C-alpha cells in the first residue's frame, strides 16, 4: 500500500555476476542496517566463475558495494592415507545468503568434493558448502555437513544408503532466533533431500582452516527414507522456521519438497528432531508446490501462519484449457493443538508464465494497522512480462484477496525482478519496514522505502 515506487535506491554489481540472486538485511553490532547481496557467478582469481558476496551500506543513492571476501582457492589435504579435495569452480557462492546477529552465512550449493584413496575415489560430487563471516571482527568459518570419506564402492554395496554426496547444502538456509543455522540440501540421500542444523557458535569454535573434514558434535541431520514418495522430492528446496506446536521452547521447521510424491509437491512442518507434525500436499502435479515457503502471523492472533508458493500452477479456464500463472496458498494456524486444515485463501496469478509465487516475503506490518503483510513476486508477470511484486495486506480473517499495491519492474526484460525478496526491516529508521528486491538478470537490487499512509 504505502511503499514508495517513485524514489527507489539501486545497488549494482559486476556484469554477469547474477548480483541480487539472494539478499538479506544485516545489522552490525551497533544496529546499523546494511544489505548483504549474493552474486553466485562472480569471477574468482583464476578468471573462473566462483560466486561472491557483497555487503552494501545503506545509502539513498545506492551504487557499488564492497566485497565480503572469502577463500576461493581449491584445497587438498593428504591425511589418513587419503586425499581430500574441494573444488570451488562454479560453486555458486552467494546462491543463498542470510544474516543473524552480526554474522553472515553465504553458501555455495555447487561446491564439489572428492576423496582419493589409491585407485578408488568417493566421486567428485556437489556436497555444497557454507561460509560464515563476522564482518566487524574478520572472523571466518565454514560448514559442510555432507562431506564424507567413504569410497564409491561402499555406496554401491549398501544400495546408496545415507548417500550425502550430492547434498548441495546451503541451497536454502535459515537461522533460528536462538542461533541455529538450518541448511536445506535437496540432493541429500540420493536426491531425497535432507536438512542440516548446527549452532552458529559451535561452527566457529569447531572450525580450523585446512582440516576439510571435522566433527561438529552439536549438529543434527534429518533422516534417509526407503519410501518412494520421497524419491527425487528435493526436500529442502526451501526452508523456514516458526512456532507451530504451542511450545515456545521448541523451534519448528518448515520444509519445501516441490517434487514430492512423483512431482505432486509437498511442504512439511517438523520439530527440531525432524519428526513430522503436518504435511501439506500439492494441488497439481509439476506446479512446484513448495518452491517457496514463508512464516508470519497475518491475522494478528499471535499464531504463525504458513504461506506456500506454487509458481507453475496452471489455472483452469474456459474451453477446458489450462494456463500457467502460479499460485500462493495461505494456511492459518488453528487455536491450540490442531492440524492445519484446508487453505484459508488462494491467490492465483494473472500473466501467462508469470510464475506468481516464486518468492514470498513477510513484510511485517507495512501500513501499521496491527496486521502483518506479505509480498508475492511474479518475476515474469505484469503486462510486459518484465516482472511484478504484489503486496497483500493482513486482516482479521487472513489476507486481502486483492493486492493493495503492485511494483512493476524498473529493469529491462529478463531481470527476474522479484526472484529474491526480503522485508520487515526498517533500513532508513523512519518507523516503517522496507522491502529489498533482487533482479539477478540485471545484476541489481532495488530498495523500496515504506512511507506514511496516504
Amino acid at each position, epitope marked *: 500500500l504505502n511503499l514508495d515506487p517513485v524514489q527507489l535506491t539501486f545497488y549494482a554489481g559486476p556484469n554477469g555476476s547474477q548480483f541480487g540472486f539472494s539478499l538479506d538485511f544485516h545489522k552490525d553490532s551497533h544496529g546499523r542496517v546494511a544489505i548483504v547481496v549474493g552474486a553466485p557467478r562472480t569471477l574468482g582469481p583464476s578468471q573462473e566463475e566462483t560466486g561472491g558476496v557483497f555487503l552494501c551500506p545503506w545509502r539513498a543513492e545506492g551504487g557499488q558495494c564492497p566485497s565480503l571476501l572469502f577463500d576461493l582457492r581449491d584445497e587438498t589435504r593428504n591425511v*589418513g592415507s587419503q586425499t581430500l579435495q574441494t573444488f570451488k569452480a562454479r560453486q555458486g557462492l552467494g546462491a543463498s545468503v542470510v544474516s543473524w546477529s552480526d554474522v553472515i552465512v553465504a553458501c555455495a550449493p555447487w561446491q564439489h568434493w572428492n576423496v582419493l584413496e589409491k585407485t578408488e575415489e568417493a566421486e567428485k560430487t556437489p556436497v555444497g558448502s557454507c561460509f560464515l563471516a563476522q564482518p566487524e571482527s574478520g572472523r571466518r568459518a565454514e560448514y559442510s555437513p555432507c562431506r564424507g570419506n567413504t569410497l564409491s564402492r*561402499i555406496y554401491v554395496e549398501n544400495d546408496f544408503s545415507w548417500d550425502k554426496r550430492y547434498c548441495e547444502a546451503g541451497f536454502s538456509s535459515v537461522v533460528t532466533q536462538a542461533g541455529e543455522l538450518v541448511l536445506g540440501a535437496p540432493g541429500g540421500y540420493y536426491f531425497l533431500g535432507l536438512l542440516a542444523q548446527a549452532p552458529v557458535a559451535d561452527i566457529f569454535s569447531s572450525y*580450523r582452516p585446512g582440516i576439510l573434514l571435522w*566433527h561438529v558434535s552439536s549438529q543434527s541431520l534429518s533422516f534417509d527414507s526407503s519410501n518412494p514418495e520421497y524419491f527425487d522430492g528435493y526436500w529442502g528446496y526451501s526452508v523456514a522456521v516458526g512456532e507451530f506446536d504451542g511450545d515456545l521452547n521448541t523451534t519448528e521447521y518448515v520444509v519445501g519438497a516441490p517434487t514430492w510424491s512423483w512431482t505432486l509437491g509437498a511442504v512439511e512442518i517438523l520439530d527440531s528432531y525432524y519428526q513430522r507434525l503436518h504435511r501439506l500436499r500439492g494441488e497439481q502435479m509439476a506446479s512446484y508446490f513448495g518452491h517457496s515457503v514463508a512464516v508470519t502471523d497475518v491475522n494478528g492472533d499471535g499464531r504463525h501462519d504458513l504461506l506456500v508458493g506454487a509458481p507453475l500452477y496452471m489455472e483452469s479456464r474456459a474451453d477446458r484449457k489450462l494456463a500457467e500463472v502460479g499460485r500462493v496458498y495461505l494456511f492459518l494456524q488453528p487455536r491450540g493443538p490442531h492440524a492445519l486444515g484446508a487453505p484459508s485463501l488462494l491467490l492465483t496469478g494473472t500473466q501467462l508464465y508469470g510464475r506468481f509465487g516464486s518468492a514470498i516475503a513477510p513484510l511485517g506490518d507495512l501500513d501499521r494497522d496491527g496486521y502483518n503483510d506479505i509480498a508475492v513476486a511474479a518475476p515474469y508477470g505484469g503486462p510486459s512480462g518484465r516482472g511484478q511484486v504484489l503486496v497483500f495486506l493482513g486482516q482479521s480473517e487472513g489476507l486481502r484477496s486483492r493486492p493493495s499495491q503492485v511494483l512493476d519492474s524498473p529493469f529491462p526484460t529478463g531481470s527476474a525482478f522479484g526472484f529474491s525478496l526480503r522485508g520487515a526491516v526498517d533500513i532508513d529508521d523512519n518507523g516503517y519496514p522496507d522491502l529489498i528486491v533482487g533482479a539477478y538478470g540485471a545484476n541489481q537490487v532495488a530498495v523500496y522505502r515504506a512511507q506514511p499512509v496516504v
Partner: antibody, heavy 119, light 108 residues
Framework: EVQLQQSGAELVKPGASVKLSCTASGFNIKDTYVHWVKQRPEQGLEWIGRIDPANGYTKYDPKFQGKATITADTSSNTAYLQLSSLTSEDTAVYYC????????????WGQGTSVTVSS | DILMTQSPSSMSVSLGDTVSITCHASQGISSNIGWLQQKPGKSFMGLIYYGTNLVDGVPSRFSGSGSGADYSLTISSLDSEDFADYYCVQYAQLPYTFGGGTKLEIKR
C-alpha cells in the same frame, strides 16, 4: 563432557584370549572414529587399529593382524578390542582414542586398561 | 611405515624456562601431526592437532609449529604441572606412528 571409560585391568594366561571394552560417556560412540593404542615402557606407543562404529569398518596395522580384533556395539555405546593367543609381549597398557574435531586426530584418551600375561 | 624420531629423550629444566621438543619424520606429512602429554602414572591428554591447533582446554603457553617433516612443540614459562612425558604422532598415513617420547625433568 567427553570421557572414555575403559574396563578394569586383566590378568590372563598365555594362549588364552581377552576382550577389552571402551564405553563412551557424554556422547554417542557412533560420532567419530575409535582407535586402539598399545603402550609398553621399552617399545613405547604403537597404533593397533581403528573402527567406525557407525558401520563397523576397521583398519589395522599389519603387525597386529591376527591378534587384534576391534568391534563396536552402538546399543551399549561401547567399543571392544579382542586379543587372541596372548603372549608375554602382549603385556601392555591399552588405550582407546577418539578425535576432537579433526576426523583423523587422536585427542581424547581413556584411562587405560592394564593387561598382564603370565603362567 | 613413517618413522617418527623425537628428540631429545629427556631434558633437565627449571620452572619458567622456555623449552622446545622436536619431532622429525621419514617423509613429508604436511602438518598432519599431533602432540600428547602423559603426566606421571596417568593417562594421555591431547595438546595439539594438525601441527598448530590447540586442543580445547589446553593453556596458551603450549604452541606447535613446523612444516614438511620437521615439527616442534614449545612450552613458554614451564609450570609445576608441565613436568611429564610428551609424544608426537603422525596421521598422514596408515598405520599411525608415534615418537620415542620426551620426559621433562626437574633440574637441580
Amino acid at each position: 563432557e567427553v570421557q572414555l571409560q575403559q574396563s578394569g585391568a586383566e590378568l590372563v594366561k598365555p594362549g588364552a584370549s581377552v576382550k577389552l571394552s571402551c564405553t563412551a560417556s557424554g556422547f554417542n560412540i557412533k560420532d567419530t572414529y575409535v582407535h586402539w593404542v598399545k603402550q609398553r615402557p621399552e617399545q613405547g606407543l604403537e597404533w593397533i587399529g581403528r573402527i567406525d562404529p557407525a558401520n563397523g569398518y576397521t583398519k589395522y596395522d599389519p603387525k597386529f593382524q591376527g591378534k587384534a580384533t576391534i568391534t563396536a556395539d552402538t546399543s551399549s555405546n561401547t567399543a571392544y578390542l579382542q586379543l587372541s593367543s596372548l603372549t608375554s609381549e602382549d603385556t601392555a597398557v591399552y588405550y582407546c582414542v577418539r578425535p576432537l574435531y579433526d576426523y583423523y586426530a587422536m585427542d581424547y584418551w581413556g584411562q587405560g586398561t592394564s593387561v598382564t600375561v603370565s603362567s | 611405515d613413517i618413522l617418527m624420531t623425537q628428540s631429545p629423550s629427556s631434558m633437565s629444566v627449571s620452572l619458567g624456562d622456555t623449552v622446545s621438543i622436536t619431532c622429525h619424520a621419514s617423509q613429508g606429512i604436511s602438518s598432519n601431526i599431533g602432540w600428547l602429554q602423559q603426566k606421571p602414572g596417568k593417562s594421555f591428554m591431547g595438546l595439539i592437532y594438525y601441527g598448530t591447533n590447540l586442543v580445547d582446554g589446553v593453556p596458551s603457553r603450549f604452541s606447535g609449529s613446523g612444516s614438511g617433516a620437521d615439527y616442534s612443540l614449545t612450552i613458554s614459562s614451564l609450570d609445576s604441572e608441565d613436568f611429564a612425558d610428551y609424544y608426537c604422532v603422525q596421521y598422514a598415513q596408515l598405520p599411525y606412528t608415534f615418537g620415542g617420547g620426551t620426559k621433562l625433568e626437574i633440574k637441580r
